[PDB]
């Protein structure tokens, strides 16, 4: 979900099932999240932030203060 298939990481797996294995799994999750963060800063596309269906997402404030359909959708969706 949400570009987790475009990033590469390892999954911490414990053996004993005690608190020490869960603590080591959590700190290893903190270690692998650093390389997911590294991949996310390494590849980031230049594009829009919201979906462009204006009936499910609020439009830009310039379009709201300039155009009519964006003002109607801003009024309705808010």
């Amino acid at each position: 979900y949400d570009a987790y298939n475009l990033v590469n990481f390892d999954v911490p797996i414990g053996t004993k099932g005690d608190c020490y294995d869960r603590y080591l799994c959590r700190v290893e999750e903190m270690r692998q999240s650093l390389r997911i963060i590294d991949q996310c800063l390494n590849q980031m596309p230049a594009g829009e932030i919201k979906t462009d269906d204006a009936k499910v997402a609020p439009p830009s404030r310039s379009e709201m203060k300039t155009s009519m359909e964006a003002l109607i959708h801003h009024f309705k969706l808010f």
């Binding site: 462009d52 269906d53 204006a54 009936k55 439009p59 379009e63 203060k65 300039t66 155009s67 009519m68 359909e69 964006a70 003002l71 109607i72 959708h73 009024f75 309705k76």
Partner: protein, 680 residues
């Protein structure tokens, strides 16, 4: 009239011929978006939102003006229909102003909801940085209508409602092309008793409620269903209450009573619920002026005056009194040894026994099927204007000939004025008159008599003879005898057994004269004796409370739950929108508490046993919304102008909107008189 087979949305339907594609699709549930088609107006094509795709056709068809034939396949959810609706709607949205945050119809605009439902999501209008958009000047309409024609989409709903139902020709569309403007060519006041409905009929909001200017928003509104008591129709309304405040009054849908319309006195009386209200019980001190007195002291003062009266008491019903308040007053007077009760508006002698003497026996829904109607001393467009809308519909749709007996009146349609002589109606009962042949030759004839003509000294005689004429002309499932009584409380009071006429309580010489919400001023201090403890149980008290000795407060029709019976005899129930201001209570609760203070309490404690006693006195006074038809029934007009129409009731008298309307109408009258007299 065999039905034909139409496949709409690949779904079979059997429709009678002559119906539109929009009706044939609304028979199964799917609705086509519309701007220039109302169900009660003429069909037109000033917008093109009704373009639906029928199969094997080159062009889309306008669904609100398409007589469908045998075996058409209509595709509402096709790609061509959605592309056509998106294109036509972005054309509608090209020049419209970005006024939604400062527009009072925002949140209930049809353009916003159809832009979310059927329009596109963005604008392709790149020409707003240069050459701009269209802007037009605001037209000068009076104090009921706020006009900004920049928001208008030119659908001519207002023009069609003025030309057909309202009857005034002052509205029209001027010019050609983008410059068409939907407004009057000159600065004129669009005066009509049905002007408020145009605010309902504008789909976008170019025409706006001017009393309801910038007050609230549609999602903020709590909507409560009730009835209006200002006119005789008993029209179903919805009241906009938000945070203990009455905002506006809108029509409610019923085909039998109002048909989605509302009079101006019915609609713009919400401003009168704030001015001149009664918030404290007031007792007349021996100094000479009324002072605000707590509830227990006022109740024991009225009880002391009742015990000092010794059974010589009387009570008069009101113009705007509740049915349950009248029942509580009658039970209090009958339990205290008084057999006399009264009503402000008089009636004939002996008409209380049969219901059809005092009912509009032909249905308001049936009056649109009339063929020839005779008005005996009434002006229906100022007494009960929705009856005049029904008569206007029967005028335009059926070949109707109407004659009026009395002075010169305008009915918004043509009519033959027989004269102001009384005995001419006997000529209508003689058969020698020319309109009598039209009345006997009609398929569904009717005769309407005003209540003010029945209050006069001839009265029952004029009530008798035309009733005999009705016994000469009757059709199955049709009662042609009709009476139109302006007071909403009159029919309920005569249902529960009120002796009509304030003179019946004047001539009884009461020591304590009870009054309900009565501001007609038919009784004064000069007709009353030297000592008379006048107790006024009302809501406003502009008149009839200055002469009272114990001014008790009360709740208005939007602040209490009660029954009102309209002129046709159909009982309806109002609902409490807001709380009463101050320490005002309901009138039946006040009368029950007064009976408990006096020492002879009424048996009912809550509203349910009061409704049970209503079943005990009349079985047709509890079936709300259901009309029981009655059997057979056995010249000057006080209301002939609009300024006479504006201030009939107490709530309309206390309102500043009606005073502003009379000021604007009189200003236009002196302006027209000065421009006419400067040419002489």
């Amino acid at each position: 009239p065999e039905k034909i087979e139409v496949f709409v949305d690949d779904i079979p339907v059997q429709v009678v011929p002559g119906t539109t594609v929009l009706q044939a699709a609304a028979q199964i549930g799917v609705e086509i978006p519309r701007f220039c088609y109302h169900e009660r107006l003429a069909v037109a094509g000033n917008c093109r939102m009704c373009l639906v795709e029928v199969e094997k056709s080159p062009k889309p068809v306008a669904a609100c003006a398409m007589p469908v034939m045998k075996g058409w396949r209509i595709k509402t959810n096709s790609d061509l229909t959605r592309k056509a609706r998106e294109g036509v709607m972005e054309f509608l949205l090209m020049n419209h102003p970005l006024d939604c945050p400062i527009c009072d119809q925002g949140g209930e605009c049809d353009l916003q909801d159809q832009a979310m439902a059927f329009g596109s999501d963005r604008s392709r209008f790149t020409d707003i940085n240069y050459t701009g958009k269209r802007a037009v000047e605001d037209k000068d309409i009076g104090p009921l209508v706020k006009t900004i024609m920049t928001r208008c989409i030119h659908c001519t709903r207002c023009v069609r409602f003025a030309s057909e139902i309202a009857g005034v020709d002052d509205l029209g569309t001027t010019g050609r092309g983008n410059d068409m403007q939907i407004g009057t060519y000159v600065e004129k006041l669009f005066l009509t008793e049905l002007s408020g409905n145009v605010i309902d009929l504008c789909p976008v909001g170019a025409l706006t409620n001017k009393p309801y200017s910038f007050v609230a928003r549609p999602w903020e509104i709590r909507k409560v269903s009730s009835i209006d008591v200002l006119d005789a129709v008993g029209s179903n309304i919805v009241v906009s209450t938000r945070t203990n405040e009455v905002l506006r009054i809108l029509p409610r849908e019923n085909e039998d009573v109002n048909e989605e319309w509302l009079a101006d006195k019915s609609r713009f009386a919400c401003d009168g619920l704030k001015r001149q209200r009664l918030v404290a019980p007031m007792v007349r001190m021996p100094n000479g002026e009324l002072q605000a007195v707590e509830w227990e002291g006022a109740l024991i003062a009225v009880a002391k005056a009742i015990k000092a009266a010794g059974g010589q008491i009387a009570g008069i019903s009101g113009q705007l009194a509740d049915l349950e308040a009248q029942v509580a007053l009658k039970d209090l007077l009958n339990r205290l040894g008084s057999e006399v009760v009264a009503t402000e508006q008089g009636f004939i002698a002996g008409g209380t026994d049969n219901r059809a003497n005092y009912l509009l026996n032909s249905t308001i829904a049936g009056l649109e099927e009339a063929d020839a109607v005779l008005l005996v001393g009434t002006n229906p467009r100022y007494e009960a204007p929705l009856v005049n809308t029904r008569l206007r519909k029967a005028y335009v749709h059926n070949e109707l000939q109407i004659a009026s007996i009395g002075p010169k009146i305008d009915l918004s349609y043509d009519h033959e004025n027989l004269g102001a002589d009384a005995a001419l109606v006997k000529d209508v009962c003689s058969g020698a008159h020319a309109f009598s042949k039209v009345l006997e030759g009609a398929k569904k004839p009717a005769i309407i008599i005003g209540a003010d003509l029945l209050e006069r000294a001839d009265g029952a005689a004029i009530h008798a003879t035309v009733a005999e004429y009705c016994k000469k002309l009757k059709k199955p499932n049709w009662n042609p005898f009709n009476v139109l009584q302006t007071n909403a409380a009159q029919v309920g009071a005569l249902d529960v057994g009120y002796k009509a006429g304030a003179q019946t309580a004047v001539k009884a010489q009461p020591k304590v004269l009870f009054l309900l919400n009565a501001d007609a001023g038919k009784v004064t201090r000069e007709q009353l004796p030297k000592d008379c403890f006048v107790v006024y149980i009302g809501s406003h008290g502009d008149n009839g409370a200055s002469i009272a000795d114990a001014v008790l407060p009360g709740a208005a029709y939007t602040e209490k739950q009660g029954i009102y019976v309209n002129t046709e005899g159909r009982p309806q129930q109002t609902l409490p929108g807001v709380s009463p201001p101050g320490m005002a209570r309901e009138d039946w609760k006040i009368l029950r508490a007064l009976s408990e203070v006096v020492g002879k309490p009424l048996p009912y404690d809550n509203l349910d046993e009061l409704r049970n006693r209503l079943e005990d006195v009349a079985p047709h006074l509890t079936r709300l919304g259901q009309l029981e038809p009655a059997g057979d029934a056995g010249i000057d007009i006080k209301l002939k102008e609009l300024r006479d129409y504006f201030m009939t009731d107490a709530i309309s008298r206390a309102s500043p909107t009606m005073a502003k309307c009379i000021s604007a109408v009189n200003k236009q009258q002196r302006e027209n008189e000065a421009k006419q007299s400067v040419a002489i």
